[PDB]
Structure formats: C-alpha cells, structure tokens
Design an enzyme around this catalytic site. Structure first.
Site, PDB file in Angstrom:
ATOM      1  N   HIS A   1       0.812  -1.214   0.000  1.00 24.33           N
ATOM      2  CA  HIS A   1       0.000   0.000   0.000  1.00 24.33           C
ATOM      3  C   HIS A   1       0.845   1.263   0.000  1.00 24.33           C
ATOM      4  O   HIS A   1       1.462   1.601   1.015  1.00 24.33           O
ATOM      5  CB  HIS A   1      -0.911  -0.003   1.229  1.00 24.33           C
ATOM      6  CG  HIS A   1      -2.010   1.016   1.172  1.00 24.33           C
ATOM      7  ND1 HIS A   1      -3.212   0.774   0.537  1.00 24.33           N
ATOM      8  CD2 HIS A   1      -2.083   2.279   1.655  1.00 24.33           C
ATOM      9  CE1 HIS A   1      -3.976   1.853   0.626  1.00 24.33           C
ATOM     10  NE2 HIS A   1      -3.313   2.780   1.296  1.00 24.33           N
TER      11      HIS A   1
ATOM     12  N   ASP B   1       0.353   5.400  -1.190  1.00 27.43           N
ATOM     13  CA  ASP B   1      -0.656   6.398  -1.579  1.00 27.43           C
ATOM     14  C   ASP B   1      -0.122   7.526  -2.464  1.00 27.43           C
ATOM     15  O   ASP B   1      -0.674   8.637  -2.472  1.00 27.43           O
ATOM     16  CB  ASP B   1      -1.343   6.991  -0.336  1.00 27.43           C
ATOM     17  CG  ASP B   1      -2.486   6.131   0.167  1.00 27.43           C
ATOM     18  OD1 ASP B   1      -3.437   5.887  -0.609  1.00 27.43           O
ATOM     19  OD2 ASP B   1      -2.429   5.703   1.343  1.00 27.43           O
TER      20      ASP B   1
ATOM     21  N   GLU C   1      -9.091   1.415  -1.888  1.00 30.72           N
ATOM     22  CA  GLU C   1      -9.083   1.504  -0.435  1.00 30.72           C
ATOM     23  C   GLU C   1     -10.426   1.966   0.108  1.00 30.72           C
ATOM     24  O   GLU C   1     -10.623   3.152   0.422  1.00 30.72           O
ATOM     25  CB  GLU C   1      -7.945   2.408   0.055  1.00 30.72           C
ATOM     26  CG  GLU C   1      -7.789   2.347   1.571  1.00 30.72           C
ATOM     27  CD  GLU C   1      -6.572   3.085   2.104  1.00 30.72           C
ATOM     28  OE1 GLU C   1      -5.969   3.909   1.360  1.00 30.72           O
ATOM     29  OE2 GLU C   1      -6.216   2.828   3.283  1.00 30.72           O
TER      30      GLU C   1
ATOM     31  N   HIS D   1     -12.850   2.161   4.527  1.00 32.96           N
ATOM     32  CA  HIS D   1     -11.777   3.021   4.988  1.00 32.96           C
ATOM     33  C   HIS D   1     -12.057   3.356   6.469  1.00 32.96           C
ATOM     34  O   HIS D   1     -12.387   2.453   7.245  1.00 32.96           O
ATOM     35  CB  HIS D   1     -11.596   4.248   4.078  1.00 32.96           C
ATOM     36  CG  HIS D   1     -10.380   5.047   4.405  1.00 32.96           C
ATOM     37  ND1 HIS D   1     -10.442   6.352   4.851  1.00 32.96           N
ATOM     38  CD2 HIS D   1      -9.069   4.703   4.420  1.00 32.96           C
ATOM     39  CE1 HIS D   1      -9.218   6.785   5.099  1.00 32.96           C
ATOM     40  NE2 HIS D   1      -8.366   5.804   4.848  1.00 32.96           N
TER      41      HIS D   1
ATOM     42  N   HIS E   1      -8.100  -1.564   7.929  1.00 31.70           N
ATOM     43  CA  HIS E   1      -9.180  -0.618   8.260  1.00 31.70           C
ATOM     44  C   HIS E   1     -10.473  -1.181   8.850  1.00 31.70           C
ATOM     45  O   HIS E   1     -11.197  -0.445   9.528  1.00 31.70           O
ATOM     46  CB  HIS E   1      -9.542   0.261   7.057  1.00 31.70           C
ATOM     47  CG  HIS E   1      -8.538   1.331   6.786  1.00 31.70           C
ATOM     48  ND1 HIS E   1      -8.546   2.543   7.443  1.00 31.70           N
ATOM     49  CD2 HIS E   1      -7.471   1.356   5.958  1.00 31.70           C
ATOM     50  CE1 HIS E   1      -7.529   3.272   7.022  1.00 31.70           C
ATOM     51  NE2 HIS E   1      -6.862   2.574   6.121  1.00 31.70           N
TER      52      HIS E   1
ATOM     53  N   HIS F   1      -2.059  -3.002   4.831  1.00 34.48           N
ATOM     54  CA  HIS F   1      -1.274  -2.145   5.724  1.00 34.48           C
ATOM     55  C   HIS F   1      -1.841  -2.158   7.152  1.00 34.48           C
ATOM     56  O   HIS F   1      -2.566  -1.252   7.558  1.00 34.48           O
ATOM     57  CB  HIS F   1      -1.060  -0.715   5.151  1.00 34.48           C
ATOM     58  CG  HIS F   1      -2.319   0.057   4.857  1.00 34.48           C
ATOM     59  ND1 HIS F   1      -3.305  -0.394   4.001  1.00 34.48           N
ATOM     60  CD2 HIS F   1      -2.709   1.287   5.263  1.00 34.48           C
ATOM     61  CE1 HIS F   1      -4.269   0.510   3.932  1.00 34.48           C
ATOM     62  NE2 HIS F   1      -3.928   1.540   4.685  1.00 34.48           N
TER      63      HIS F   1
ATOM     64  N   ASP G   1       2.641   2.107   3.706  1.00 31.37           N
ATOM     65  CA  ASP G   1       1.765   3.280   3.747  1.00 31.37           C
ATOM     66  C   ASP G   1       2.498   4.564   3.363  1.00 31.37           C
ATOM     67  O   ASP G   1       2.081   5.654   3.752  1.00 31.37           O
ATOM     68  CB  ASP G   1       1.080   3.436   5.115  1.00 31.37           C
ATOM     69  CG  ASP G   1      -0.166   4.294   5.032  1.00 31.37           C
ATOM     70  OD1 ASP G   1      -0.955   4.069   4.084  1.00 31.37           O
ATOM     71  OD2 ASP G   1      -0.353   5.201   5.880  1.00 31.37           O
TER      72      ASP G   1
HETATM   73  C1  LIG Z   1      -6.325  10.650   3.440  1.00 30.27           C
HETATM   74  C2  LIG Z   1      -5.353   9.576   2.981  1.00 30.27           C
HETATM   75  C3  LIG Z   1      -3.933  10.145   2.888  1.00 30.27           C
HETATM   76  C4  LIG Z   1      -5.446   8.383   3.929  1.00 30.27           C
HETATM   77  C5  LIG Z   1      -4.582   7.202   3.465  1.00 30.27           C
HETATM   78  N1  LIG Z   1      -5.164   6.546   2.260  1.00 30.27           N
HETATM   79  P1  LIG Z   1      -4.352   5.842   4.665  1.00 30.27           P
HETATM   80  O1  LIG Z   1      -5.716   5.237   5.080  1.00 30.27           O
HETATM   81  O2  LIG Z   1      -3.534   4.803   3.913  1.00 30.27           O
HETATM   82  C6  LIG Z   1      -3.380   6.424   6.074  1.00 30.27           C
HETATM   83  C7  LIG Z   1      -3.899   6.030   7.483  1.00 30.27           C
HETATM   84  C8  LIG Z   1      -2.878   6.485   8.549  1.00 30.27           C
HETATM   85  C9  LIG Z   1      -2.623   7.954   8.580  1.00 30.27           C
HETATM   86  C10 LIG Z   1      -3.873   8.743   8.933  1.00 30.27           C
HETATM   87  O3  LIG Z   1      -4.466   8.490  10.005  1.00 30.27           O
HETATM   88  O4  LIG Z   1      -4.274   9.611   8.127  1.00 30.27           O
HETATM   89  C11 LIG Z   1      -4.335   4.556   7.621  1.00 30.27           C
HETATM   90  O5  LIG Z   1      -3.976   3.714   6.770  1.00 30.27           O
HETATM   91  O6  LIG Z   1      -5.023   4.283   8.606  1.00 30.27           O
HETATM   92 ZN   LIG Z   2      -4.077   4.656   1.907  1.00 31.87          ZN
HETATM   93 ZN   LIG Z   3      -5.204   3.154   5.037  1.00 34.98          ZN
END
Ligand SMILES: CC(C)C[C@H](N)P(=O)(O)C[C@H](CCC(=O)O)C(=O)O
Ligand SMILES: [Zn+2]
Ligand SMILES: [Zn+2]
Length: 393
Positions: A20, A22, A123, A150, A191, A212, A320
């Site tokens: 994963h 982003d 995601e 998510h 998630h 992740h 991540d």
């Molecule tokens: C909005 C975008 C960048 C969120 C990401 N797709 P993510 O879901 O990959 C990062 C997150 C940890 C970091 C946070 O809490 O934002 C988690 O995986 O729980």
């Molecule tokens: Zn992500």
């Molecule tokens: Zn995530």
C-alpha cells in the site's frame, strides 16, 4: 559484510512487494495530477516519500498503488477512476522502470526484467457505490484488491475506526466478498473492524490480505490485527502486510495521539478539525509534549510477534508511504526497507524467511486468488444482487 550490505543483496534477489503506497492520492492533492510538477524520474524527496530512484534504492520490486478516495465526499466512483488513470499515466510515463501487473505471472515477469511490477488496490468499499457491476468494472480496469472499508462504516461493512454498524459484514457485504472471490480480487481487511475481519474470513473462499496493518497485541489500536485473527491466516492462506505508521506501531505514539485528541476535545474541537484555531491548540500540545518517534526496531517487534502467531508464510510489508505524514526513523521514505531487513537479519530471520516476507508470500497469495477465481467463474455466472434485495430497504 554488514547486515545492511547483506539486506541489499537479499533484496536484489527477492525484492519487496509493498502492499500500500498512496502516491496517487498525494499527486491528486499536491498538484491535481500535474505529473510534470512531481516527476518521479527526478528527486521528489522535498514533497513525497516516493520516487523511482528511492524505490530502487529501497529494493521495491512490486507496488500495489493505492487508488484511495475519500468516503466523506460525493463522487467516489469518478474519483476512483481518476486515481486509476493516475496509476496508468505513471506506468506509461516510465516504461523503463515500471511494468503494469495484473497477475502473479506478471509480477515474476517484471522481476525477471528488472522493472517494478505496478498493481492497484482500491481503499474502501465506497469505491463501488453499492454496485457489484462497478466492482467488476474496477477489476476490469486492473484493481486487484479492495479494502472493504476506509475509516468510516459503509452500508455493508463496519470500520475499525467507527462505531458498530451492521455488526461486521451485512448480507450484501458477504455478497461483495463472494464476488471478489469470483473475480479474483483480493479481500483487504486493513481498516475494518475485528467483527468484519471474522465475517470476511468465514465467507471468503480465497486467501485474504491486510495491505497495511500491524499487530494489536504489540500495540493496541483498532487499525491493528488481533491475535485470534492472525491465527486464522494459516488456514485461510492469506497474509498480513505490516505497516510503518508510527501511531499504529509505537505504544508511546498511540498514547500520545490519544492525549492529543483528548486535548483537542478539551478545547471544544473535533479531533480531526484542521482550522487555524484548532491547529494552534494542537501546536501548543506538541510544544509541551513532543511527538514520540518510532524506529525500525518498533516495526521489527511487530513482525516478530506476527511471525509467531500467523507464521512466516503469512507476512508481508505495506509501508503506507505517502499516506501518512509521519514515519519511523530509518524508514523515512521508500528507500528505507533495507534497514528493516538488516534488523530482521540481526534478530535471526533466515534468508528464506525474508524472501517470503518480501516477495514469495505476496505472489503466492495473488496466484491463489486467481486459482479460486478460475473455479468460481467456471461454476457460476456473476451476481446481479442488489443491496436492497439482500439487506432490505
Ligand atoms: C487521506 C489519505 C492520505 C489516507 C490514506 N489513504 P491511509 O488510510 O492509507 C493512512 C492512514 C494512517 C494515517 C492517517 O491516520 O491519516 C491509515 O492507513 O489508517
Ligand atoms: Zn491509503
Ligand atoms: Zn489506510
């Protein structure tokens, strides 16, 4: 040679399949996909965790590029198509370095020719807008996993970072899992709530992944995986791809974030409020209580425990990168993986253990999804079911 030198040698033979990254969302947000402004054929260390040179230095041989979009905004399907288009454009712009991969065989073909196999993972189930045909369209466009939620519940699945909703998967949620199994799309349980994890494992006829997530026993946070779920991976055949997010892996960081969030609420702000006024409050907190910093050792502690409970055949890595603003020392960007491999060598991990962790487990799991899909596609046609039919009005 040093453990770091050995790590690099091992990665040259069996590179990291990262679960994963982003980058696409980062490109969407920073430059609205003006790829020339963030050309990954150049050094993007000022702006991004990811570029081609650092991927190579890091020993990354395959990447699931996240096509994440926000669940709290309209037009998720359109946005997901834009994220997919971004990945497509990156692959087309850098044919010397990247190769599209749709299958396990494509991953091996990429490895043989020294290009980074480039896959896609959606995601959050909101990316299909409660539509099984839309799920099938995403698969047709190249999506090879979907995280079922998510950060928020959707209509048919419960998120770990939301209140209980349907109690795991709803009837339609189980239907989504069945259709993912038939298509050959990996079910991703990062998630999701622990209830959702168990329901997905009950339902799925294919190996599942966590693209992740780390260990809840090591660091108690809902984004991490409980031992009882890890124990089910050997039977299911799937794999947990450890993540580097500090506030998930380091106890002190979980505690700090909880205290930061409490402090925000004490000032009458939602913990996610990003206004200048809320930011001033948070800044004052961090002033008096500095942010703790995770290390490579922190991440290795998770892998050690996950190895004990899940087994070495059921582990991978999902950093991540470009999804989180904070990183462990030694894992500050995508060039960092050899530091983790070196730490694991120092802890007695074998060369074959490490080749499973980086490469072999991920390829096995995608091949298994393909194998399960062959059987199901031959056995029945695609589902035409709706959420109203299965879950009620
Ligand atoms: C909005 C975008 C960048 C969120 C990401 N797709 P993510 O879901 O990959 C990062 C997150 C940890 C970091 C946070 O809490 O934002 C988690 O995986 O729980
Ligand atoms: Zn992500
Ligand atoms: Zn995530």
């Amino acid at each position: 040679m040093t453990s770091l030198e050995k790590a690099r040698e091992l990665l040259r033979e069996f590179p990291v399949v990262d679960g994963h990254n982003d980058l696409p969302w980062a490109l969407r947000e920073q430059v609205r996909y003006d790829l020339d402004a963030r050309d990954i054929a150049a050094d993007q260390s000022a702006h991004l965790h990811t570029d081609l040179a650092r991927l190579r230095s890091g020993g990354v041989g395959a990447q699931y590029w996240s096509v994440y979009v926000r669940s709290d905004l309209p037009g998720a399907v359109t946005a997901t198509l834009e994220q997919i288009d971004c990945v497509r454009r990156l692959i087309d712009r850098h044919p010397g370095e990247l190769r599209a991969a749709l299958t396990a065989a494509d991953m091996e073909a990429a490895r043989a020719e020294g290009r980074i196999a480039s896959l896609m993972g959606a995601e959050g189930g909101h990316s299909i807008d409660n539509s099984l045909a839309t799920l099938r369209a995403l698969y047709a466009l190249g999506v090879r996993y979907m995280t079922l939620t998510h950060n928020d519940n959707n209509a048919w699945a419960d998120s770990a970072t939301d209140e209980p909703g349907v109690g795991g998967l709803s009837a339609f949620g189980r239907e989504v899992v069945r259709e993912m199994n038939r298509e050959g799309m990996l079910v991703d349980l990062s998630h999701v709530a622990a209830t959702t994890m168990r329901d997905a494992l009950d339902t799925s006829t294919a190996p599942v992944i966590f693209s992740h997530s780390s260990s809840r026993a090591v660091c108690d946070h809902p984004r991490n995986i409980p031992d009882d779920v890890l124990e089910r991976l050997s039977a299911n055949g799937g794999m947990a791809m450890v993540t580097f997010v500090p506030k998930f892996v380091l106890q002190a960081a979980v505690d700090w974030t909880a205290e930061a969030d409490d402090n925000m609420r004490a000032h009458g702000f939602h913990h996610l409020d990003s206004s200048p006024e809320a930011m001033k409050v948070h800044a004052a907190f961090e002033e008096r209580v500095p942010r703790p910093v995770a290390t490579v050792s922190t991440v290795a502690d998770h892998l050690d425990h996950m190895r004990e409970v899940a087994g070495v055949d059921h582990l991978g890595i999902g950093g991540d990168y470009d999804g989180t603003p904070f990183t462990p020392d030694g894992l500050g960007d995508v060039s960092g993986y050899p530091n983790l491999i070196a730490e694991l060598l120092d802890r007695g991990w074998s060369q074959s253990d490490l080749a499973k962790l980086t490469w072999k487990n991920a390829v096995r799991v995608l091949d298994a999804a393909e194998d399960v899909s062959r059987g199901l596609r031959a056995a029945r046609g695609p589902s035409n079911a709706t959420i109203e039919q299965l879950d009620g009005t």
